[model samples]
Target chain A: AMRQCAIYGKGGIGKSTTTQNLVAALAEMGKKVMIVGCDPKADSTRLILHSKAQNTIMEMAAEAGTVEDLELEDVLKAGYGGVKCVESGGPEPGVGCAGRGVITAINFLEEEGAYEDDLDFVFYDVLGDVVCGGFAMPIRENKAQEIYIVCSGEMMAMYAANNISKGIVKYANSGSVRLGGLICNSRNTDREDELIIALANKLGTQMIHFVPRDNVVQRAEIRRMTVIEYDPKAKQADEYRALARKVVDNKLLVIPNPITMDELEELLMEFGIMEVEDESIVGKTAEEV
Target chain B: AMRQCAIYGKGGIGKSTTTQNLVAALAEMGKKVMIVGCDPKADSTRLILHSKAQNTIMEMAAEAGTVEDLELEDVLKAGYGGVKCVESGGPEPGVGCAGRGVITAINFLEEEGAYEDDLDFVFYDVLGDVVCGGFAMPIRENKAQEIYIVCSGEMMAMYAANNISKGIVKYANSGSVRLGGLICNSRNTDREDELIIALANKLGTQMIHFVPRDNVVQRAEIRRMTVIEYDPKAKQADEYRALARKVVDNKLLVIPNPITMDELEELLMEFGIMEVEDESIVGKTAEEV
Candidate 1:
């Protein structure tokens, strides 16, 4: 049975990179894997495909003038480790939304029969910030049942993780998409691991893996490959392999109790990202300073 | 009194261009008009501004990183005949939504006092398709009370016109936004004028203007000017002037009875745009072809 998973996080949070690496590990473990890139930037499939960018369903459709003009072969591309890759290329940045691109691409995929029965796992590497319905396309009904949030120990990242949890709660209440676990892509800050672990606890999910900060991972990415593929003998590769093992065996899923704005602010204050509000300093201008 | 009219239609059925041209005619008549480009594409202000695109409130908010960072002057721009222009730009084409952009721009304009006490009219050039809640911003509680749908003799256009009337009926039952009239932006076929008049009668509205098909309009568009602005002495300009007169003196506001899909199909059949489906061919595949 194919486990359809979607990984979501804030923009520029290495969602694609992390997803590709983990998927490479999964592929190495003999799982028939596929990775779908759901970002407008179209960079999600690059590392997997060893190409700069792959022609996505949306880009091709847009160029060809409409969604109906596209075929499944135009969107799907084969990649390393027998992993099938597809990137839902979005509109030009800052002109139109990429999230809608995700929705359109996924809907096209569904309509075009892109999901074959041979695949063991299909990973949706979604764009950052669940700001609209477009980004929520992956976890919608009959799509990804399991969602893993990638986060660092930073305050903004933690808040984003929580916000993602909120989005999941909204869908999970009425649908099957559940918060699977958190994958801490390590930042190596003071008490970084502990902070994420605490956050995962508060969110009512576990930190599935704590991937330590490693330059070899970056080096591997530069080579358009995962540590698992570029250097299977490396310790970092073994870490990813372990991470993949946990994902294959993992079953803990829950409807997270996402924190409120006030609660989130409080958490930020506790973490030293923001100070408690002071009424007297509110009206102070730069001239006054 | 300058009638505050809003134009709504399908996604790409020339609502913005029609609104701008009509407003241009009103401007030529010495009516002080302001155009609110309610679509996320922000094309409403383009013809008026004589520019490719104007910075919208949402776009500025996005650029400044948040709505709090935006100022009134950042997005609003003046257009021909001193017609005040503003757009509610949204997340790129498909991501978040342009609907929210419309609401945000309207709220921002209200906050900034864009609608002056002495202003004659404020025309909302809405997107053709009103899909979500945000796109219906103009026809809400206390905004645009009268709507003029610009339609042609095309099948989709007629369908859209009926759908828009349905939308109006929904709002008119609860609010003040009533069906003012239909402006036939005529794509001259054999009996296009008669067909629209019939549609208007079915919709409980009148054909406000029968804008004749003219190549001069496109020529004027190439110059980035309305027919009224580019060649006021042109015959097409007189057509617009006539449209302006009707809009100025129009009083036929009514609660529209938007027809159903079946009814619309019947209307189409009356117009010879659709034929009644034979039940025997319903489930037959193209393999039979």
Candidate 2:
């Protein structure tokens, strides 16, 4: 029994950090897991590996001649608690199809039987912005059936979540992919949890978990460890543990109904994160106004 | 003579806001500026247009049939201070090529003779993360020869700046594209100006301007007006004016020398934004440590 999941978020929205910590928690329960990092940043498993960035499949394969020249064992690494890790390197910003590397990497994993029957889960940490068709590989290919959007109460974070949900809707209509829920990495916005819950409801999903803002996360990060591994008893560590348990038992996946920009702005305005603008004032200068 | 420029930065780093205000500053100087917004978020011209996100060329073209069926005047709009604005809408997350719309939009702009000889400048507001080749159309095609990376002292912003430099370098080797410098929208990080200046020096460019954090920006934004238009006498308004003057006379463009991840982290570490980690602790659990 295995589940393939993808965690999506805009860059710096804590997708990597949350996935690593959550993976650490899952490993704590003896679940065999693997994280396929899809972001080009390549720091997806730094905390789990507890050191430098992992070598990506693209980086290694290019160095070796072709994809076939590289072996699975050479690309995969076992991090803390034995969570397997791999990174799918992207193009040099503007050269090639970014999604191709991810497709190749996954095919390689399957070719070598990296998806052993004993594995409990495969987590793909992906960029939510979906810069191109290539970045949307996981959802389009149905490689990850469950997608969780990690976001904050901030305007752009919610904006990205809505956009990501729109992407899921496109793939969900024809595939098994479904939006699991939103995971709010609290930015300490006023009533942050409440705001995300409202947004989740609008998207027809639950706020799977509210990860509170904590300095302890930064402390654990500096040590290159997850809160669970750095200090198992820390409050933040248990917070991730609860998130882990919730994810393990989660069954509330749905095809998200993405909101319009006005609807999103309305919600933000309701929460005081945005202010209403007069459409009439548009294109008018201060003198004209 | 007309100068074509592109302003890039990670999402939410204020690339659009900064570009809009800078354009306004230039407009106040009676310079003819046109903003070809390349960001898919489509909010790039919100401040310039002083209203809802401009209808993207892609969206309008799709509704009317193909790009050829779209009219130049139909897609282009004159906003506050007589500035021209247009947006290149992108594809849905998992569909077609991400950058195709940008290329198509640019082609359409050229076909329609929108780049009149009287134009003093064209600023392209782009996402710095450059998810794929499509998003980098402006730089790759050498459509924007001068590039400015808007950044803050925040770690992610600087990290994005460095990666973008790498992209510019690749294209610069074969094209006329060069990094104009960095635009620091201050987030008030410790020694913020000093940190970015250090980064600018490393990138072989200058910190063109430091737009200090000010609440007036938000107040002006609530009214959907640029600072220059909201209150021309405001201190923040003058900041953009000065930034505008600097751009008009800037001559420090060069091929950016992007640093390695280690070097960037080391810089952050030197500035107390990061700490040294012991490699031995990697993959070690609390019990093992």
Candidate 3:
């Protein structure tokens, strides 16, 4: 049996960068793990496979004519620490739902009995803001019970995290899915750790990790490896390892209570990210004002 | 005839800030404009309207039981510089297609004749990476003939811009939609202007603008105003004014020729954003390496 989870966040929020490194740490700790990338771009497993975006399920299915024609071995490639890697690629843009690919890929894995008993974790790294289609496949199908949003202190990123939480709340109330926590991927914003912790506390979750903005992540990424896999001696590598430890023993999960826009803005105001504005001056032209 | 365009970029690449400000510049020049926000979070037009997230079309439709029950004035709020604003909000997350909301909103706008004859420009500010559903609504419906991807020098941002170009090529071939250019909202990445210019050249388009990273943008936003509307005398206001002129005079639309991952990475390598690494060292742990 495996605990399934997804590292969800808006694009460019360091979801894959953080996911690959953390899961690599889990593998380093002797846990069997699998990574499924729900993004159609299929780049999430690069560091895990120590390779570029590998073969994806939908891409393979398209070549073979159907999902039934493919095998788990044909798509699932093991990378660092025996971590299985697969990406759920989708139809060409402007064609149809990308979520179909996620559903198809997960179903393929399930049908093939690829979830071996020794597998301890299956991490679905998905794009945020896409609450539609296969992006929500893991949660919809009940394959993912824990959800982690990778975000920063930026207002837009926090806004997206709250909306994504809006989507998760719906599914959570209907089924078994619950929000695990928020993982703050530092963007060098002001008081980020404190703000994320405050935001997490308001959401009824924990700031499971505050991965500081370090050049080592970029350095390792240039080598197509996670810090844990490339330079285990680095202090940043130790940071990821501790995050890995926290995630493994984490038992707190809940229906996330996302904040209203006004509430969030007030929080930002307190943190000095946003200021209490004069509502009367809204829409006033320079000449008019 | 109104020229329809959409500002797209992966989430938090500063799409809304750039779009709202540039459009405000357009409005400042007396170009009657409308902004249709396709993101469910509905934060894109906040600055333009000098208001928080207003009532989204889908939200109103849901509460009223149907989209037809609404009017142009019911949802469309004129913001700074006479820019009309509307957000196509979708169902509370985890329900269904967010694009459905986009389609419904547009259909309602069209049938209700909201795209009045006086309108000179309509900007669809959207979340990048979710190319399926109504997120692609503007392109698929043959309404948006031009697209601008807001990006930065970050590899992840460039990577997303390239893939979004992939989606655009499809719709471009089928219809009149064309890529306008890349707008770099400076994230202070190294040699960003040069890098974005190179990337744009590779994509068969232009680097329309390289917006400098400034605290003035945050300062302006604290007042819920675009730089153009909030502080006309600010240097950044003039910067956006020039971008507005470039956009109005922009005629270099083309079916973007996106590059291969290898090519993009090579470009990043050229700019020192990525480095050439040994493929043999991939998947090798520190001990093994």
Among these predicted structures, which one has the highest DockQ? Answer: 3
* lDDT over C-alpha atoms for residue B128 of model 3: 72
Query: TM-score ranking from best to worst?
Result: 2, 3, 1
The lDDT values for all models are 0.71, 0.84, 0.84
Candidate 3 deviant stretches above 4 angstroms: A278-289, B280-289
Least lDDT summed over 10 consecutive residues: which range in candidate 2 chain A? A279-288
Residue-level lDDT of model 3, residues B1-289, one tens digit each, is 7899999887778888899989989988989999999877788888987777888998898888877788779899987878899999877666788678788888888888888659999999887767778887677768889999999988777877887788788876578988999999997888889999999999999999999888878767866778887678989999999999999999999998889988987888888877766677655655775
Scanning candidate 1 chain A in windows of ten residues, the lowest lDDT window is A280-289
Worst 10 residues of 2 chain B by lDDT: B277-286
| Descending-lDDT candidate ranking | 2, 3, 1
Q: Candidate 1: list runs displaced more than 4 Å.
A: A66-69, A94-96, A271-289, B1-102, B105-108, B111-289
Question: Per-residue lDDT for A1-289 in model 1, tens only?
Answer: 8889988875555677788889988878788987888765567877677666688777688779888877776678777788888887654321344466778877777787767658889999875443356676665454888889888876556766876676676566567888899988876766667677778888899999988778776556545556666667888878888878888999998988776545655655565544454434332222331
Q: Across all candidates, what is each one's fraction of true contacts kept? A: 0.03, 0.58, 0.68
Candidate 3 docks with a DockQ of 0.58
lDDT of 3 by residue, A101-175 (tens): 888888888899878648999999987767767776666668788889998888777877787787778777567
lDDT of 2: 0.84
* Candidate 2: regions farther than 4 A off: A279-289, B278-289
Q: How well is each residue in A176-199 modelled by candidate 2, as lDDT tens digits?
A: 999899999987778788889999
Ranking by DockQ: 3, 2, 1
